[PDB]
Structures are given as C-alpha cells and as structure tokens.
Amino acid sequence: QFRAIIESPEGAGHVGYQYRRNTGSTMRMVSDVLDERVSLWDFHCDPSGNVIQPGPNVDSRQYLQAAIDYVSSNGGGTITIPAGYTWYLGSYGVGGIAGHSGIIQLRSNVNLNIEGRIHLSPFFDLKPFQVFVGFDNGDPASSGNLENCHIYGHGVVDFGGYEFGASSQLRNGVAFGRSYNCSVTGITFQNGDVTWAITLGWNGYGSNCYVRKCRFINLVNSSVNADHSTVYVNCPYSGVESCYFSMSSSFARNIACSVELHQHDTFYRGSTVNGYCRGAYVVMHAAEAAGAGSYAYNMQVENNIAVIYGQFVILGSDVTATVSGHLNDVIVSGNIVSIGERAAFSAPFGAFIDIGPDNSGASNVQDIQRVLVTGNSFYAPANITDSAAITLRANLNGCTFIANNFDCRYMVYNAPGTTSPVVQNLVWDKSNVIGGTHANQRAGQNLFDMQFASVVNSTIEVQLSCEDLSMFSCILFPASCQLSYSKITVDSAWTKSMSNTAVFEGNQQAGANVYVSYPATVNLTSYNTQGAVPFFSTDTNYAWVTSAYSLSINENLDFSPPATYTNKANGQLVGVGYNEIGGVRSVSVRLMLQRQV
Amino acid sequence: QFRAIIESPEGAGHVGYQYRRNTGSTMRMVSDVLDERVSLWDFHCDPSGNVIQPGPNVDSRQYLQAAIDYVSSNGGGTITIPAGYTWYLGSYGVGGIAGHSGIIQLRSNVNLNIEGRIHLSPFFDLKPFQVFVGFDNGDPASSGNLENCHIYGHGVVDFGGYEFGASSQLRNGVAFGRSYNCSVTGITFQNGDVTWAITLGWNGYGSNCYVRKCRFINLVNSSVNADHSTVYVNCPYSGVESCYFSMSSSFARNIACSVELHQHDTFYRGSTVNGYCRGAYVVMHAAEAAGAGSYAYNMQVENNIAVIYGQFVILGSDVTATVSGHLNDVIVSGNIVSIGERAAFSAPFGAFIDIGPDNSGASNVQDIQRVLVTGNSFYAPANITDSAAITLRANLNGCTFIANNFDCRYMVYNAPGTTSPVVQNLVWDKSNVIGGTHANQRAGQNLFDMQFASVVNSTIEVQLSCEDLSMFSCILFPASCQLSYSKITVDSAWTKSMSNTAVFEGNQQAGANVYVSYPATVNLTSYNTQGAVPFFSTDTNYAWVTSAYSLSINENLDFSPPATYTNKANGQLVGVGYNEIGGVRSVSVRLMLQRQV
Amino acid sequence: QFRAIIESPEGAGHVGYQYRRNTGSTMRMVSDVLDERVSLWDFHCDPSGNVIQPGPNVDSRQYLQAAIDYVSSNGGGTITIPAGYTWYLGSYGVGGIAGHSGIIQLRSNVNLNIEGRIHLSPFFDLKPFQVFVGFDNGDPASSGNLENCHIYGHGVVDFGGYEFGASSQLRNGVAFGRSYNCSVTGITFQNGDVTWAITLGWNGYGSNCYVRKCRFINLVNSSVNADHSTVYVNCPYSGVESCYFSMSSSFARNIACSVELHQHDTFYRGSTVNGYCRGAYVVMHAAEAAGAGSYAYNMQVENNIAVIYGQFVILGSDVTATVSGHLNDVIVSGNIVSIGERAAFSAPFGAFIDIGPDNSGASNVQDIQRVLVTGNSFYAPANITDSAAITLRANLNGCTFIANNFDCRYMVYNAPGTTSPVVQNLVWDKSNVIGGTHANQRAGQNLFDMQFASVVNSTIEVQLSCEDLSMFSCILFPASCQLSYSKITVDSAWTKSMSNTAVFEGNQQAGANVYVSYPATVNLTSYNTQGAVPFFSTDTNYAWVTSAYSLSINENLDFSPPATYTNKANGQLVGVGYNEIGGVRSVSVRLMLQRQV
Numbered sequence A, B, C: 001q002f003r004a005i006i007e008s009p010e011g012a013g014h015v016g017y018q019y020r021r022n023t024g025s026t027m028r029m030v031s032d033v034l035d036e037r038v039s040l041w042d043f044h045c046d047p048s049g050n051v052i053q054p055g056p057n058v059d060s061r062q063y064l065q066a067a068i069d070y071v072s073s074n075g076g077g078t079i080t081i082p083a084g085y086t087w088y089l090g091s092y093g094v095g096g097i098a099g100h101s102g103i104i105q106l107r108s109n110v111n112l113n114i115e116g117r118i119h120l121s122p123f124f125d126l127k128p129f130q131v132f133v134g135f136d137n138g139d140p141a142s143s144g145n146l147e148n149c150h151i152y153g154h155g156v157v158d159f160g161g162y163e164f165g166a167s168s169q170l171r172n173g174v175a176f177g178r179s180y181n182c183s184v185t186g187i188t189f190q191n192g193d194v195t196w197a198i199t200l201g202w203n204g205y206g207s208n209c210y211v212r213k214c215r216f217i218n219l220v221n222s223s224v225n226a227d228h229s230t231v232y233v234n235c236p237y238s239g240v241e242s243c244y245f246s247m248s249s250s251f252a253r254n255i256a257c258s259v260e261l262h263q264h265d266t267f268y269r270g271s272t273v274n275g276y277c278r279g280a281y282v283v284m285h286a287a288e289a290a291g292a293g294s295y296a297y298n299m300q301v302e303n304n305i306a307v308i309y310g311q312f313v314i315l316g317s318d319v320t321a322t323v324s325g326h327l328n329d330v331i332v333s334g335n336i337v338s339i340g341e342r343a344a345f346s347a348p349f350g351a352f353i354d355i356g357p358d359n360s361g362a363s364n365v366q367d368i369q370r371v372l373v374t375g376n377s378f379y380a381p382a383n384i385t386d387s388a389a390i391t392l393r394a395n396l397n398g399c400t401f402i403a404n405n406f407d408c409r410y411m412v413y414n415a416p417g418t419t420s421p422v423v424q425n426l427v428w429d430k431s432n433v434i435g436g437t438h439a440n441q442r443a444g445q446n447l448f449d450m451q452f453a454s455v456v457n458s459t460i461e462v463q464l465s466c467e468d469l470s471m472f473s474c475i476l477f478p479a480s481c482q483l484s485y486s487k488i489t490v491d492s493a494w495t496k497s498m499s500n501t502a503v504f505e506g507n508q509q510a511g512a513n514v515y516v517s518y519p520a521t522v523n524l525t526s527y528n529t530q531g532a533v534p535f536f537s538t539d540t541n542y543a544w545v546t547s548a549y550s551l552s553i554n555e556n557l558d559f560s561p562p563a564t565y566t567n568k569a570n571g572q573l574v575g576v577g578y579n580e581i582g583g584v585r586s587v588s589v590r591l592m593l594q595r596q597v
C-alpha cells in the first residue's frame, strides 16, 4: 500500500526532506520543496493528467492560462516557460480579453519567466491579436487593474511572420492594461506585422510600468499595416530604457515609430533604433486625459542612438470638446541621430524635432512649451533636401535649443503654402553648431525658412562654421510673417561673400522691439572736404539701423571711411571718416548692420 | 524499515536521481538537488520541526535569522522569501545589531531574494528600528565588514504605517554597514515614517554598493519625523540608478530628500522623484572622512526627473577640529526639475542648486569647487517668489553653469541681512537660457541679486529671451559686495525699456579688473559747430567707460549723434557726430556702455 | 524490487508528484521537476557517477564542458555554478577552442548562472588562456556563430594572480566570438594579468552583445603585460553599461584602457573607472571591417566617471591595402574625468580627447569627422604639464566641442617637431569654460598651441574665466601652419595685462577668409589740429584690420582718442578723435582688433 502511495501523484508528499540534514530545519516533504516553483509543465497536460509535448500542432494557450489562473489564486508567483521548447499559441482567449482579441490574460502578482519561445500559430494569419492582455473587461473603462505583473527572461515572443489581413485591425504583444508596477525585461519580440509590441497603461491609468533590455526585431512587414509604434506608454511614472529596436522592411521606414510617451513623468533612454521612420512621439492627447490629467509634463528623451528615415522626436497636443491637452517640461538630450541613406522626399520629411499637427491636420489646437533640446547630434546625408533640425508645422508656445550639433539641409523649416504656425518663445542659442554636410546644396533655399503666421519672443542666433554660398539666405521671413519682440542675429563668420544674410521681406526688422544684426554690403559717398568728412549711404533703406560698423579693410592711403555709422531720418547711413587729401570718395563696404544690439 | 527511512526527514536522501536519465550525469539523491536552493520555509518551523504559517500573529524574525546564519556557515547562497505570503517581523534582533535597533542581521555572501512581502508588526509602533543591518557590532568602528550581500526581487518591505514616537528616534530599512559589493534591486519600500530606506557604507568604509530599480513610496507620514533621506550613500564607488521615489504627505514636502551622496565616485542617475522637499545632498562631512578621505570628488547627478518643493541639489562641505571636508569635481547634467504647485514661502526656498551652510548654520567653513551644472531644465510656477536657479548661501570656491534652461523667479539669489558668502569662480555662461514664466512678477526684485561679501574671478553673462519690465534690475551688487577680476554683461535684447539693467551700488564696475557691459540711457549735448562736432554727456558718471555705442535710431535729418563714444577725465562721455547744419543739439540716446570689453 | 528502483538513479522517476495537490495539474514524477533545472553538480562526477568535491586539486573543466555540451543538445538552458564553492580550472579545452588557448567552449542558448567562484589553477601560470570561448573553430573566419549565450550572477572569475610569461601572449576572460545576443551581467572579474576581460564579436561579426553591472578589479599586474583593454567591443549594436573598473598596479597607469568601441552603433555609458591609463578607444580599424563594413558610426561615450593617467577617449581610423576605415557620428557627453595625482610626464600625455596616429605611427591615414564633445568636465592637477582638452596628433576631418568645462594645462595641443596634422572643421565654441587650476604655471606655453600643417573651416572662440599672465599666448599659430576659412577670437575678459593674446607667426590672420578678433596694445599719435582730429598708429602692422575699438579709459580732459578705428593701405590704424584744445597727442591704448567680425 506504501508503494501505491509513492507511485501516485501524492507520492512526493510522503517522502521526507530536511534541508542539508540540518536538524534545526523544517521537517518537510519533497512535494513542499517542489511546490516552491511552478512551470508550464505543471499545467500542460491532457484531461487524464498526462503531459503533452508542445509543438506546431499543439495549442498551448489553455494550459498557460490554467497556470496563470491557478497561481493567481494563491496570491501570485512566477511561472517559468521552459527553455529548449517552443510553445505555440493557436486560439483566442475567452471572457474579458475577448474584446481585445486577447490570447492570454495576465493576472496580478503572476509573473512570467519566459526562457523558451512563444510562437503564434497560423490560426492568427491575417487576423487581429493581442498576445498578453492585462485588462479583465472588454470595456477598459470598466476593467479592474493589473498590478505587480512582470515578464522577463532570455526568451522570445515570435509573431509568426503573418501579415495583417486589413488595415483596420490591431495587433499587440503585451497590453498591460490599467497597469501598476508591471514590466517587461530581457525579452525578444520578433518576426511580425503588428501595431505595437508593448502598451503600458490605459488613458493615464497605471503607474511604474517599464520596458528594459528588450529587443524588437522586424515587427512590420506589409503594406496593409496602417501604423506601428513599438512601445506606447500610456500611464505616468513609466518608461523605456536600454532597448534595441530594428526594422528591415521598406514599409517600416514610412510607418514605424519606436516609442510614444503619452503621459507625465515618462522617459525613453539609452536605446538603439535602426530602420524606423520615427524615434518617439511625445504628446498629450486630450482623449487620453482621464487617468492622469490633461498635462504631459516631465517628459525625457535622452542618450539614444538612432538611424531613422523620418522624424526623431515629434511633439504635439490636442483637444476634444471638453478637454484640452497640454505638453510642457520636456527634455531631449544626449541623443545621436541620423537620417539613413535615402533619396530626397522618399520617406516622411527628415527632422530631429517635428511640431506635428493633430490627427485631423489642425495646427491651431496645440499647447506646447518649456521644451529643452540640448547636447544632441543630428546628421542627414547631403542629398536629403527634406532634412531639418526642426520642422515647425503647428502652433508652438516654446522650444529652447542649446548646444546641439545639427548637420542637415535646414535648421528651422516649415513648408510655404501649408500651415501658418503661430510661434512663441522659439530660442535658438548661438551655441548650436551648424554643420557643413549640405554646403553647396542649398540653391534657392533659406537655412532658417521662417514660414509662419507670426514669431514673438523668439531668439535666432545664426552661427555658421563653414561657407555655403549656394544658400539664398541664412534666415528669411516672408512678408506674411509678423515678427515682434525678438532677437535675430547672423554672425559675420563665413558670410563675407553672401549677397543675402538675413532677409525680411516685409521689412519686419524695423519693429520697435526687434533686435537684429546681420552683414550687408553698402555703397557710400563722401563730401569733398579735406579733414574729418561725412560718408553717406547712397541707398535710403536703413531708417531702422541704430549702428553699423566696418567688416572691410581700407585699401586707400589718402582717406579712410568711417569705422562706425549711425542713420538719418531719410534712411541713409552716416559716419565721420577722414580725408587726408580732399575729394569726393565712393566706396563699397561690408558692414555689420545693427538694430538695438 | 525502508518505508520508515522514506517517510523520515532523510527520505529524500535515499531516492536516487540522475539528471534527465543521462548516464554521464552524477548519480545523486533527490535531497542533493533540493539542497541546491533554500527558502524561509526551510527554517520557519517550531521546535519539533513542524512548519509554521506566517501571518500577523506570527513573528518570523528568528526563522529568517536562522536561515541567514545557516547559509552564512556554508559560504553563502540566496534565501528566497516566498511569493504569495506576508512575513511579519515582531521583535528586535540580538547581539551586534541591538545597538542599531536592528531586526535582522545580514551576513556576507548571503543574498535575499524577496518575492513575497515583509511587514512590520505593531510591536514597532512608536519605536525605532533598522530592519536589515549589516554591522556585526554595536559600535560601527569595531564592526567587521559586510561583503557580497544582495537583496533583490519583486517583493515588498512594508513599514506598517507606524509613526515615529519621538523625533530623536531613527528608522531604516536596509543598513548595509561597512559594506563592500552590496546591493538592493527591484524592491518596493513603502508605508512608513522612517529616517532612511537604505544606507550604504559607514563613514567612507565600503565600496561598490548600489540601489537599482527600487521604488520608495510614502515613507514619511508624521510631524514627529525629524528628517528623511531615502538613500544615504556613505561609501565610495556606489550609487543610485533607475529608482522611483514618491511621497504624498505634507510633511515630506518640508523634510524629505531622495538621495544623499557623501563620498567620492558616487552617483544618482535616471530616477524619478515626486512629492519630496529635496532631490539630493552632495556633501563632504568632515565627521565622515575616516574610511575614504576628506574629499568628495567625482559626484554625478544626472538624467533625473523631479517634482520637489524645496531644493534639487544641495552642495556643501564642513570641518571638525582635526579634519576639513572638501567637495570638488561634481557634475549635475540632464535633469528635468520643477517646483510643484505651492504658495510662495510655504516650503523651503525653491532652488535648482543650493550652496547650503553647515548644520550649525556656518557659511565660512565650505570648500566647494569645480562643479559643472549643464544641460538641465528647471521650472517654478509664476507665483513662487522663493525660486532660484542657485541660492548661494555659503562660501563658494567655484561653480560653472553652461547651457541650462532656468525658468523661475531668481537666477542667482541670496537673502540680504543673512549670510555674506565669499564667492569665487562663479561662472554663468551666456548659453544659460532665462525663461519668462515670472515676467511681470518681479516688482522690487533683482534677477541676479548678488548679496555677497565679495565676488572674484566670476562671470555673469545675462541674456534675456523676453521682456520683464517689472524687475528692478537684471543684476545688482550692493555696496557691501566687493567685486574684482570679474566679467558682468547684460545683452541688450529685451532691455530697451528698462530703467536699470546692471546696478553697482558701490560703483564697483570701476574696478581695474572688472570687465562689464550693459545698456543705459544717456543725455548728450553738442557744440554748435557745423560739420564734424562733439557730443558730450550731461552727466559725469562715466569715468569707468572705455567705449559706448548707440542702441537708438537717429530721427533727425540735419544732424547725427556719434555712433560711438569714449570718455573724458571728468566722467563725461564724448564722441564725434555730424551737424549738416550748425546748432547746439540735445538728444537722449540708449547706449551700450562698455568697460574693457 | 520496488526498493531497488527507488534507490537507483531512476528512483525519482518513480515517485509521483502533482503541483500543490491540484487535480488539474500534470501528473508528473519528481525527476521531471528536478530536470527543470541543472547545475554543475549534475556533471561534476567521476566515471562511476560519484560526485567529486571541487577544490584547488580538482580540475573542474571537463565537468563544466560536459554540462554545457549536454544542455546544448536539448536546445539550451541555464547551468548554475553553485554558490559556496570555488570551482578550479586546471587544463586547456580541446578542438575548436584550442587555437584560442581556450579553457571552456560556450554554446548557443546555454547560459551560465555563476553564483560561486571560478578560479584558475597554477597550471596557467606564465601561460596564455581565454577562459570562455564562443568560437567553434581555430580560425575565426571559418567559425560558426555563438547565439543567445548569457553569463550572469553574483559570482566571480578569478585569474589566480598569475603574471604573463611573455609579452606576445594573450589572455582573456570571455571571448564570445562571432556573437549574437550574448551578454555578461553582474560578474566580478579579478586578480590577474590579462589582455582583455571580455571581447564581443569578431571583426564586425555579431550583434546585440552587452556587458552590464560587472566589476573588473586588478587585471594588470606585471611589466610583461604588453597591453590591456578590459572590454573590446568588436560587433555592432553592442555596448558596456553601469560597470566598475579598478586597477592598482603602476603598470596599468601606462598600459590599461577600460573599453574599446570598434564597430558601429556601440556605446559605453554610466561606468566608473579608477587607476587606468585610458578610458576608451573609439576607432575603425580597416583590418576589422569584414562583418559590419568600414565605417564606425553611432558611437556613444556618456555619463562615465573616471580617474585615469593618460587619455580619456582616443579617436582614430586607419587603412589596409584594400579597405579604408572611417570614424564618424560620435558623441562624448556627460562624463566627469580627472587625471589622477602624478608627476608631469610620468605617464602617457594627459588628455580628454586624443586624435591618435595609427599603430605604425602614421598621422595621414585617418578619416575622423562629425564628432560632438559636449557637457563634460575634465580636470588635471596644476603640476601636470602634459594635460590637454585635446591632443590633436593626427589628421582630423572634424570635431565639435560645446559647453564643456576643461581645467588643465592646454586646451588644444600637439607637440612641435612631431606630426603635422591636417585639421578641418575643428569647432571650439565660446561656451567651453576654461578653468583656472593651471593659472601661473604656463610660462613659455600657448593655451591653444596650434602645431599643425594646416587649419581650415575651424572655429576657436577663446574665453578665459580668470587671469593667467604666465602664459605666452592664448593661441599661437606657427608660420608653418596654414590657416584659412576660419574664425579665431579671444574675448578681452582677463586679458588686459597680456603682452600677447593671439599670435600668428606667419601673419596668417591676414588671409582673405580668416575672421579674427583679439586685444592688443597700440601706440597712436594725433595731428595738432583743434577740433575733430585724426589719430594714427605709429606701427604699420594693421593692414589686415577691418575695425578696432577702445578697451581703455581716457584719462585726459583736453582731448579724447577715437572710440573706433579703421586702417589705411600702409598698415596704420586711423580714427577720428577730438582735441578740445589743439596739440599733437600721443597715447598708448588697449584695442580690440577685428578682422571681418
């Protein structure tokens, strides 16, 4: 009768054990010690309790769910998905996750240690799915929370390579739901056509959710795929750190973004991106303001490495009928980003920062301010016409650039004949270094092309570090752009031979509170008088000039033009030079024109 | 007789096992394999060896200690604190940790994998405690070391919500002691009223101690609590990375600091703080110099996100009778910090950097230098009068600010009628961007309020990015502040309408080695002479001016004032203008006054 | 007969188990559950299957290899190296790793959890070795890959303290080989004389290899050791993060480097270094271009803390007969670095950045560009003559410095009579702060010593923050250095008493596209005329000057020199001053000389 017990499933519960023969240790049974761990093998069995080998013809979903449900009932634990095996999923889950096209329901305090591989079976080909779902209701607004759920290990989630069947479908790897202290660490997500790999939170509900040391490889593969963002961070106090993102499909270059940060106190740091269209969206959607309020603040994008084809960071905020989204207190620092090799205009417009209009294309709903962009490097190959430090395409209430290195076609850009952004508090510090890769490519183009409705309380301190005589101007304001309470300067270095430096097509530099300086060539003529003698400009376009000074040597012995000039009411410049010998003098001089500076 | 063996505690030691039926594998017994792991269950038993269920009426302390002591005796290992259970602690420990109000003694090479919850029982209500202590003696100076002790997992240390019983009491979570290669990873510390959560090292003794991916939630809850700093780093080559700190109590806004760094080669990176008074102290206490010397150098505070109510980083050093503390080689970079919503003066003075007097209030003991503050963003709401980029309240031997974005009431501040710091090597680079949130709030106030005993070898390059005509001045030096061998400039942008820009109440700008430029309005009158004609200032307050130039347009046709001016011995300005027609001229002009620049 | 089965090695395979008595769980045997884990104990046995205790007289190599080989055959898993034991290695491995002096062969998907200690036995004294090798062939070009191999834990690899027997020998800890998704985490490598601790990849072959939270302690100890670099990163999309490196040997101060990055998309972040010669090499060796191409781009060195004796980051690229290496798109940011206490010239030349000639000493093979060095702090003690922000010793095609704090002897340096680098696109922004530690030490020395063949498209904006009248000049160009299309400025602050500020020994500032300004003292004399009167320089060395302005006060009542000056064809300066009373005037004035700026 003892033999029967020992060979029964209660057998281990009759074999005694004491840790290391320590007489001070608990007198236990072997089953107690084995019960301290749990794996999928403990649930991957047929109705008679016989273990089933996983494989492409076995659907492991019900067994994994049984494991999760059971461990949940004991207050949690960690289930191991064993190494050396591929565990296939081949059906949809039931109940609360069915509304989410869910496969597996995650549960609070039940962690998954994925050491083996989880593969999607062809049941999912051309269909929607979300592999792991933390919602417990079809309607997220009526869902309970997921808490203390961690997925980690050296294993792999493989989406089977299946294309989307229709653009309207959604696909996800891990949707944590209304998620508090949940995380994914170490996992490789690969070989799919999905909308997201991981979503965190739901419309501001959730906290302390993180993606760390994960890899995401080849997760877009078709023209059907409407849009892809690898990680969507939709709860506060959450972020993505030390991850690796790679795409190889041409479609990903037009549709894929690595991360989005959609709630306050979120971050994206220390990650490497290759083959994506975009780096990160940093936005406040009014529609997503329920859980954590209508402000996305304390947003951090730092120390990432990227090769992308479109825009690195996209800023935005928008409104609904009853809620207004605001984006403020953002830092973008220490990133090194390039636009990968491509033809001009062959992917979305290349940019380090984009101020993006809302999903309906509106440029007059945004409330974006207190952004710092500092200590980044950006590069686009010389052929890429559509490359800018910032594409400023919607209303901006402030963005500050200090000590970056931007090596691309444009510094500030917006297309003419499109949006007319209202710009406030745009600061471009003199410590921004403008690279020379695009020198000689800029025929017909303005380095800072200020195609806006208006600019106020802004600073543009242009500093070249090499010549580019191809450009039409360093900075141009069309007559349609109002300019007030602003500082616009062009340093003279490398500008001696430029026909135009700063261009104000509406004469906007004459504004009462516009502070400007830039180089210009000026023709002057003197009076005949021997001795101290006035020189006057021939042209009368300098009524706005407070002072000017020589940027040219004086090749003459018998006279010298003035070193410095002021203006007169008729718009001439005037200064006092010296005629060692008398005579009317005529000179053409390069001057630094100054207004209130 | 076999049956009896099998059911005995030696039973598992008689059941044979060979790994995966591999004939090349060791012929072992089941007990050998089970002996490869160890958990609290192996020691959580009564004197007859019967397992005891944990719970609020069970004190688990002796069992956990027995586990640690035993594993220590075998050269170490990792003890699991099982998931799905709350393990309560309800008594003090004995021996060497009793002097520290210790509960559990940590031991070298014995790691704790906390997957479940550790809770303090109400025995500890109103009492001191340190939950885990690595010292082995009541007197730390006679304590051995703790080495290779790691605490990690998804579990929780809960301090039971109990208030301090008296302000003089101390409470701690983990005190590693004289600690070498010790760490805490993943753990949540919550629900208390404590002095610290984690301390590392002891007075410079220790090395390579780290806190990573931990959460600290609601660890101050009473008015009795004297002071709280979540992590106190008191050994070199140690730090805090990727942690989350949150407080909700009003008291924490006045008393709580997230981290202190007190020894060389220490760091605080990539963390998020909410609801605290302070971010980090970075200090060298002479009293703590025994283990690692009297210099705190290589101190790093980077890439943190914070909402705080007082000061973000506090710098300091101090002395004892025989030892002098020095703080140097510090970097504060990439942080994004705001003062949270509060009334002016309702918490300690808001600051990004504070130069803090010693614990006795002395401002003349410090030796702080070679600090770099770069690429940070700081914001305080417009109502918060008590907000500064730096509150400079004690002697400073150097601090360098480059390429930050500071959006608060003051840039440099110290209160008048308090300390008179001696300031050396304060560098404020022109690349620091001054935000506009507090525009129009600054009536009676100086943006840079230089309330110091003296300033030497310093640079203040003031650059506005919007108008604020409410401020009394951009920078003011009271007559009591000596100023020498320094550069002080105010860029003209947004200053045209300011009555005062730079103010030197002791005429300190006249110093031999003071280099200054700022805008001013000057009245001039010319001689009557037709032709080249001198203009002279009516006032005689410009004996210090080396050159000046026009910041105003000339509304006249018949004459022009000089574009540039020098001075005369009587303190008038003088320049040569031009009278097309003769006559005495009188003008009021905005000039850039320059001295040696 | 049952008893015999139970005591046999198949015994555990006859004892039934069901998880937690769950009737829905798999009916398993105890051996199935034990088979879910594996340790070295399962293979550390004699030929009769009896377990062998590890120790200094036991060679564990064959047993560890048997474990790896076996687990490999089942598609992988994790082998534990148990805590509380030291496992000695005392022989070389056989087959494919013998060509690499290999001890253990790593295999794909077979992870090692090192909790105990692995020690080298004295068999290896004075011999070469590589402890863990991922190559499967003696010739790497014919080797298969290593994939999904992770080494982690709290354990230790100890190299036994043995010195190298000959300089030509190689020693390594982990050579992952042609390595894809491999990593080392948590491990301490200590007590050796080795070439490397860890190498990643092979000549560009490999991907996603990482070293995280590892310690490296005392890995150089002899004069025989030819060269040491702790981690050599030789595959793309790979890096080193949050590690600790320490050396105590004098030899390490001359030969040891913490990291090298040799392929694209690699990083070195968040680490602490003490006692090393060098921080990191960042290079493209043409010889290593097979796997990932001939460009090292997207290279990141950030947020490290270092005390070193030579150079922090060394940049380079080189060629073979058929391949040319290129280095571009590099960011060095947020690092805090000092040269440790040492005598001048007692270790390799101290530098933050070094542009290093190739291994044959050639300075004309490099293609280095698009480098950003920003937001770092560097310090060298005042006695260390051989300390520079950059030692620019080979051809440079671009490097940009913004918003750093450099406190050392030289800013830009190269030795005269050595290499004559061709320099292009060197940008030194005005936001770089120059510390004062070396003030008064610079007799005979130029702060920026431009000992190059030529300089083009470069910017040097010199800004002092304290006086140093000991220096010969702020910046000097020898006559042998061509200078064109460049901007060179010296801010006047702290320069009033300097005899020389900028020195152009070949009069190179006269170039058509050279833009310069610096202070100078100039003697002038006026004509006798009462009224507006010309002042002329006595010297004729200013044919290149476009304008000049006064940096001196005018101590006179009866006259004033000109505020501003231009030049004449004979090289005199000329300006119009004012004689209230007539008379020839003679003055010596400090002027800001300007050319095209």
Ligand SMILES: CC(=O)N[C@@H]1[C@@H](O[C@H]2O[C@H](CO)[C@H](O[C@H]3O[C@H](CO[C@@H]4O[C@@H](C)[C@H](O)[C@@H](O)[C@H]4O)[C@@H](O)[C@H](O)[C@H]3O)[C@H](O[C@@H]3O[C@H](CO)[C@@H](O)[C@H](O)[C@H]3NC(C)=O)[C@H]2O)[C@H](O)[C@@H](CO[C@H]2O[C@H](CO)[C@@H](O)[C@H](O)[C@H]2O)O[C@H]1O
Pocket: A099, A100, A101, A140, A170, A175, A195, A196, A199, A201, A202, A203, A227, A228, A229, A232, A234, A257, A260, A281, A283, A284, A285, A287, A288, A314, A315, A316, A317, A318, A355, A356, A357, A358, A359
């Ligand atoms: C793929 C992606 O992230 N694209 C973003 C875009 O996001 C929006 O489009 C999406 C397209 O997939 C998502 O849209 C769909 O999914 C919604 C959510 O699904 C339901 O709810 C979930 C919880 C459930 O499991 C499902 O079963 C569904 O029931 C659908 O409602 C919708 O019909 C789909 O088209 C995305 O929705 C969000 O998804 C996240 C993550 O799952 C959820 O947490 C949110 O609840 C949900 N949000 C809402 C409002 O429903 C859509 O948000 C972003 O809009 C843009 C951001 O950029 C654009 O706007 C900014 C700000 O104005 C501008 O600056 C830019 O210029 C402009 O382009 O970026 C895309 O990459």
Ligand SMILES: CC(=O)N[C@@H]1[C@@H](O[C@H]2O[C@H](CO)[C@H](O[C@H]3O[C@H](CO[C@@H]4O[C@@H](C)[C@H](O)[C@@H](O)[C@H]4O)[C@@H](O)[C@H](O)[C@H]3O)[C@H](O[C@@H]3O[C@H](CO)[C@@H](O)[C@H](O)[C@H]3NC(C)=O)[C@H]2O)[C@H](O)[C@@H](CO[C@H]2O[C@H](CO)[C@@H](O)[C@H](O)[C@H]2O)O[C@H]1O
Pocket: B099, B100, B101, B140, B170, B175, B195, B196, B199, B201, B202, B203, B227, B228, B229, B232, B234, B257, B260, B281, B283, B284, B285, B287, B288, B314, B315, B316, B317, B318, B355, B356, B357, B358, B359
């Ligand atoms: C809470 C906190 O960290 N506050 C710091 C403040 O720290 C000092 O006050 C503390 C208040 O709790 C600690 O003080 C007490 O604890 C001491 C240590 O306890 C004994 O020793 C330990 C090892 C043992 O386990 C215990 O059982 C006790 O026997 C007591 O001696 C003392 O009486 C208590 O009030 C703190 O002490 C240090 O604690 C750490 C961590 O445990 C130990 O490693 C150190 O050994 C110990 N140090 C000493 C000298 O004993 C006190 O240091 C800081 O002083 C300030 C820093 O800021 C201030 O100074 C700087 C520099 O001049 C200025 O710039 C600032 O302006 C100024 O405010 O910050 C507080 O937040």
Ligand SMILES: CC(=O)N[C@@H]1[C@@H](O[C@H]2O[C@H](CO)[C@H](O[C@H]3O[C@H](CO[C@@H]4O[C@@H](C)[C@H](O)[C@@H](O)[C@H]4O)[C@@H](O)[C@H](O)[C@H]3O)[C@H](O[C@@H]3O[C@H](CO)[C@@H](O)[C@H](O)[C@H]3NC(C)=O)[C@H]2O)[C@H](O)[C@@H](CO[C@H]2O[C@H](CO)[C@@H](O)[C@H](O)[C@H]2O)O[C@H]1O
Pocket: C099, C100, C101, C140, C170, C175, C195, C196, C199, C201, C202, C203, C227, C228, C229, C232, C234, C257, C260, C281, C283, C284, C285, C287, C288, C314, C315, C316, C317, C318, C355, C356, C357, C358, C359
């Ligand atoms: C120690 C170190 O890293 N020093 C670097 C230096 O590296 C070069 O010298 C090395 C000295 O140890 C290595 O040289 C030897 O090892 C080679 C590789 O060994 C064979 O192949 C391996 C795979 C196998 O396991 C072994 O059994 C051997 O069969 C030997 O071929 C050679 O004879 C030895 O001297 C190093 O080699 C590389 O090693 C890595 C890591 O193992 C491998 O992945 C590479 O395949 C291998 N590379 C090659 C080409 O074989 C040598 O590269 C660096 O050269 C310098 C960099 O700095 C210098 O150059 C730059 C760029 O021009 C300049 O800017 C600098 O100014 C200049 O100093 O730095 C040293 O610290």
Ligand code: NA
Pocket: A099, A100, A101, A138
């Ligand atoms: Na749905």
Ligand code: NA
Pocket: A227, A228, A229, A255, A256, A257
């Ligand atoms: Na997207």
Ligand code: NA
Pocket: none
């Ligand atoms: Na979008």
Ligand code: NA
Pocket: A452, A453, A454, A480, A481, A482
């Ligand atoms: Na308009």
Ligand code: NA
Pocket: B099, B100, B101, B138
């Ligand atoms: Na005590």
Ligand code: NA
Pocket: B227, B228, B229, B255, B256, B257
């Ligand atoms: Na405190």
Ligand code: NA
Pocket: none
């Ligand atoms: Na304090």
Ligand code: NA
Pocket: B452, B453, B454, B480, B481, B482
């Ligand atoms: Na004084």
Ligand code: NA
Pocket: C099, C100, C101, C138
């Ligand atoms: Na070899």
Ligand code: NA
Pocket: C227, C228, C229, C255, C256, C257
């Ligand atoms: Na080396």
Ligand code: NA
Pocket: none
């Ligand atoms: Na070398």
Ligand code: NA
Pocket: C452, C453, C454, C480, C481, C482
């Ligand atoms: Na030359």
